[PDB]
Ligand SMILES: CC[N+](CC)(CC)Cc1ccccc1
């Protein structure tokens with residue numbers, strides 16, 4: 001039962017949930033990886049990792065992925081949540097130096113992950129392990145594109161560090177541009193490709209229908225996160241959330257901002273429904289009779305199907321994951337799964 005302010009009847013009726021058959025093994029394997037890479041204290045792994053639903057989130061998204069690809073994506077994604085927690089704690093504790101050094105190491109490790117597999121900072125070592133495995137699936141050009149996108153993500157996290165230490169809430173348009181990077185829209189879009197076994201040519205993945213469908217799936221994910229994570233974020237003095245930009249810069253009340261964010265999320269859905277028709281027509285056109293055409297057609301179709309699956313996976317994740325259950329915490333400003 002989804003809270004009325006967060007309920008999206010269109011998702012519930014028209015975006016049926018999917019689950020990858022590897023999910024049971026994925027759940028345990030990622031938990032063991034968090035333990036073995038020392039990315040969370042052992043007691044917090046035992047108590048909270050399964051309830052955080054990070055593997056469920058990816059298993060409801062990259063359907064069809066080879067099991068090894070899904071494992072790498074799930075480990076990376078769990079790493080990414082831990083990194084968001086580290087960034088938050090560095091801000092709260094004023095650790096500008098520790099953050100700057102981590103930022104620098106992530107840039108270096110992203111270009112040379114093998115050199116960082118045993119780094120003294122386990123967060124860097126964990127990042128490097130997941131990235132080295134993601135780099136083993138597709139040609140170096142895909143790896144270069146993932147790296148180019150994630151260098152930009154790291155710098156967006158640095159900008160968030162600047163904003164929060166200075167108490168600056170970005171304007172709405174500034175926020176929307178920044179959120180495409182902090183939510184890592186283009187990373188999740190990149191990762192559709194190893195999940196369907198094909199690096200797409202630029203001419204295919206830049207087709208306007210593929211680009212627009214990919215954008216809308218990610219805007220929904222990020223803004224629905226903003227809608228559902230607003231209570232934890234207000235309680236933790238987070239400033240990055242579309243609702244906060246609207247309350248601060250447009251003088252909306254909390255109820256008005258929640259309504260405006262919900263309307264924007266709803267529009268992502270119906271805009272996606274329109275463009276999905278064009279993206280699937282494009283998939284059909286690629287099947288021109290040749291072997292290569294069949295390959296590209298099947299890959300685009302699988303990727304657009306996963307852009308759809310992201311809507312339902314993100315929707316239910318926010319109601320299942322312990323990450324957002326601020327009402328259950330003794331200290332609303334300090335989530336119990338974070339290392340404080
Ligand atoms: C890895 C999770 N993420 C995305 C970058 C950072 C903490 C937040 C998020 C969760 C779920 C949906 C959209 C964004």
Ligand SMILES: [Mg+2]
Nearest residue numbers: 084085088238
């Ligand atoms: Mg966060």
Ligand SMILES: [Mg+2]
Nearest residue numbers: 084160182240
């Ligand atoms: Mg964040």
Ligand SMILES: [Mg+2]
Nearest residue numbers: 225226229233
């Ligand atoms: Mg959030």
